[PDB]
Amino acid sequence: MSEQSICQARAAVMVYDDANKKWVPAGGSTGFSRVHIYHHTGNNTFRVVGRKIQDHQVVINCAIPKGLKYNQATQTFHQWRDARQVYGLNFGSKEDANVFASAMMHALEVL
Numbered sequence: 205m206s207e208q209s210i211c212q213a214r215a216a217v218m219v220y221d222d223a224n225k226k227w228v229p230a231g232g233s234t235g236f237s238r239v240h241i242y243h244h245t246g247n248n249t250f251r252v253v254g255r256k257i258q259d260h261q262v263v264i265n266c267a268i269p270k271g272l273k274y275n276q277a278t279q280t281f282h283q284w285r286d287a288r289q290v291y292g293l294n295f296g297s298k299e300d301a302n303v304f305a306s307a308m309m310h311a312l313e314v315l
C-alpha cells in the first residue's frame with residue numbers, strides 16, 4: 205500500500221467559518237469521524253483524512269506541511285491552520301487527543 209495509517213482517533217472534525225466567527229462541522233455533517241494520519245513513505249508526506257462514522261463521507265483531507273504549528277488548545281480540542289482553512293478536532297476523549305497529537309508531532313519531527 206502506498207499510504208500507511210499511523211493513527212486513528214475519534215473526533216468531530218470542525219472548520220472555522222471566519223466570516224461568522226464560528227466553528228462549523230466539516231463536510232456540513234454534524235457528528236464524529238474516524239480521523240487518520242496517513243504516511244506516504246515514497247516521498248515522506250503525511251495527510252489527515254477523516255471519515256464520518258455513520259456514512260463514511262470524507263470530511264477532511266489535508267496535507268501536513270513541515271513547520272506546521274499544531275495547537276493543543278485544550279485536552280480534547282486541537283487545531284491547526286494552513287493557507288485556506290482552520291481546522292479543529294473535538295476529540296471523543298483525552299486518550300484520542302493524545303493518540304492523534306502523538307502521531308502529528310511525530311510527523312512534524314520527521315518531515
Ligand SMILES: CC[C@@H]1C=C[C@H]2CCN(C(=O)[C@@H]3CC[C@H]4C=C[C@]5(CCCN5C(=O)[C@H](Cc5ccccc5Cl)NC(C)=O)C(=O)N43)[C@@H]2C(=O)N1CC(=O)O
Nearest residue numbers: 218220227273274275277278281283284285290291292294
Ligand atoms: C467546536 C467548539 C469549540 C471547542 C473548544 C474550544 C477550545 C477553545 N475554542 C476556540 O474556538 C477558541 C477560543 C478563542 C477563539 C479564537 C480564535 C480561534 C478560532 C479560529 C482560530 N483560533 C485560534 O485561537 C487560533 C489557534 C491557533 C494557534 C496557533 C496555531 C494554530 C491555531 Cl488554529 N489562532 C490563530 C491566530 O491562528 C479559536 O480557536 N478560538 C473552542 C471553542 O470555543 N469551541 C466552542 C464554540 O465554538 O462554541
